[PDB]
Design a protein around this ligand. Structure first.
Ligand code: A1LV9
Ligand code: A1LV9
Ligand code: CO
Ligand code: CO
Lengths: 380, 380
């Protein structure tokens, strides 16, 4: 069931913003590891004396990396005279966020019809305000409310190129890398208590619940067309193996964004390219499932994937799950930075062709059992 | 003249330590950009609950990247029970350093005969103590004194593999990159006042002055065999173009390390490999000199480099200088991170063959005039 209860018009995920100590080094690492090109900048060279912000893109996926300069460079500014291009930025908030949580996601941004209306309706329905609607160059409106922990949900709306004050990047610094990633599929938060987090977020958005030991309980919130997807996890205590959700909360100093799932139009090519680069500056992947997992795929998805395609999954360590509507291929990176907190998922979905419906095939919850069974039966 | 006045036995540069917000991302970027391999680690996986430290090597060059974890992970520890592998590390100091200066060098480390003797003699001769001698696993002694700003000179001495508590890296995570870099040639500091900085450092080391508008004044301190080389710069005010030393001091919030010069055994190969990677996660280089600079090289160094070798310098943007003893080839990167502060120099020296004497060919001061002349005569 989908009551289509969104309290304001939501379009698609727009961008993800990482708060960094040094934006240059994180952005360069991510560009090479994920195949994203440098597409826009706001920094000293563009007149921004407050923060350095670099935008990477791959298809519709937008990753923004931001770090503060010395406050001394902008000590004479006030908000009405700021040279910041993101008016919600604050030196103290950014430094506090990074000292507390390490490298991670500050903003999950969605494009909406009217960011001021979305902010007003959200706050009227219980959202904790974080940054009020600000109109940039009479062209783009941006506003922010608290999502969970120190993560904000950022609303962006456009009258009619990322944000005013950003400049497109010099051709020579813009190498056209592309490993096949095309958009953000979902963004997942870890919280101490799932119930209160769901009630809060669904309360102010009108997002509905998307239709679905482990060490976790989870639920997924979704917009009207189910293209904005926000799963949330809580830990389950007292399990044999300690909950990875609880480990996250300890190392992150509380709730925050756990993973970003990036849709690829060719997951085989994406994983070939990313794995070639794992040990030369890119991203590492979690240990691959044993061969028994891939033998068991024939009975599970032999009507969807050929043997050669199953063998390709095995060569790349790709996992496969299926619900009643479609099939998904997925794989997980090791943590993106020093702490065992945020990681990336690469996903591609098969089925639900109408365009493809959001969330086609689910989120891979069936792979908790299948991985487990595989490992025990591989002990053999 | 070389009075050989070192107050303790100094061997060679040992390592450079960067203090980072996220050590993983900086280390991965530097590994790919410079061709350095991952060789050692001290982090959660090795039992270190305090800091994450990753060692890259190329030949004898050792770059260490360190960032703090959440203090909560080590809140029950005291110094006598620490899980830190570098006992001088402090969460507050590291966070303060990074918030103040951004990504940069915390420690210039030299290997000495006896780190406790070096510390004691240094402090008896005016060095400001930073971390007292600590013996690690009865095998390695480490001590630190203030050099300039928040940069320390670190003494390391070995009884007889980087440091105890570090583990060698998994073969699969250790890709054998190598672009030809072999050792640290010199490390350069920027200070507000050159005179007092020289008197302080030469006072406690016994290092001697190495034998030698612009916007700077400089002088070089050197150990007995002139293999440890520490140039220091101060700004010159009131010049037409504002001093780049003063820009550094403003953006860095004071004195600190300006550049690291890395010797290559094949500067042509190093620059081919680094330039191939500039726009795919590596390092950018400063704008190349105009063709008039390379025409003028024939009269300056035509007895040292062939025409083809001069053309190779031109293809790669390499600069050339010469003194009375030898010739040097050099080139400079753009800043390594967000702020216009620290950068890298790649160098290779020709001549002074006895082994090669330290500092053979100088430091390129003659290139301030030659670049200037080149640009004016290229206006032509
Ligand atoms: C094969 S598996 O390694 O056990 C495995 C399988 C699927 C995932 C996900 O992507 C998750 C989500 O997206 C939603 C949030 C909680 C649920 C749903 C999942 O855990 C992960 Cl993290 C690990
Ligand atoms: C051709 S140039 O771009 O004008 C140019 C040429 C040489 C250098 C150096 O390496 C320096 C040093 O190593 C020592 C410290 C101050 C002196 C000596 C130099 O400035 C630099 Cl930074 C830029
Ligand atoms: Co997922
Ligand atoms: Co130099």
């Amino acid at each position: 069931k989908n009551p289509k209860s969104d309290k304001f018009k939501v379009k698609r995920f727009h961008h993800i913003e990482f708060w960094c100590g040094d934006a240059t080094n994180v952005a360069r690492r991510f560009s090479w590891g994920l195949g994203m090109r440098f597409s826009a900048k706001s920094d000293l060279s563009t007149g921004n004396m407050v923060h350095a912000s670099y935008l990477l893109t791959s298809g519709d996926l937008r990753f923004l990396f931001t770090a503060p300069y010395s406050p001394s460079l902008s000590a004479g500014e006030i908000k009405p005279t700021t040279t910041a291009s993101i008016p919600s930025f604050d030196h103290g908030s950014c430094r506090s966020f990074f000292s507390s949580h390490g490298l991670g996601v500050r903003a999950v941004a969605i494009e909406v019809e009217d960011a001021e209306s979305a902010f007003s309706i959200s706050v009227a329905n219980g959202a904790i305000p974080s940054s009020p609607p600000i109109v940039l160059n009479e062209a783009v409106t941006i506003a922010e409310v608290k999502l969970y922990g120190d993560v904000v949900l950022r609303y962006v709306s456009y009258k009619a190129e990322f944000l005013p004050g950003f400049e497109r990047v010099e051709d020579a610094s813009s190498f056209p890398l592309d490993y096949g990633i095309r958009r953000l599929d979902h963004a997942v938060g870890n919280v101490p208590e799932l119930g209160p987090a769901l009630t809060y977020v669904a309360g102010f958005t009108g997002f509905h619940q998307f239709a679905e030991e482990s060490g976790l309980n989870s639920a997924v919130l979704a917009s009207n067309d189910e293209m904005v997807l926000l799963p949330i996890n809580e830990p389950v205590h007292g399990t044999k193996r300690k909950s990875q959700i609880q480990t996250y909360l300890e190392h992150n100093e509380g709730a925050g964004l756990q993973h970003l799932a990036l849709m690829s139009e060719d997951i085989f090519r994406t994983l070939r390219e990313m794995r070639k680069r794992s040990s030369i500056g890119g991203f590492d992947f979690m240990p691959s499932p044993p061969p028994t997992y891939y033998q068991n795929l024939k009975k599970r998805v032999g009507d969807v994937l050929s043997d050669d395609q199953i063998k390709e999954c095995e060569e790349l360590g790709i996992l496969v799950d299926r619900d009643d509507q479609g099939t998904l291929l997925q794989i997980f990176t090791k943590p993106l930075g020093d702490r065992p907190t945020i990681f990336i998922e690469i996903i591609q979905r098969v089925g639900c062709m109408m365009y493809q419906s959001g969330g086609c095939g689910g989120f891979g919850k069936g792979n908790f059992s299948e991985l487990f069974k595989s490992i025990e039966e591989y002990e053999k």
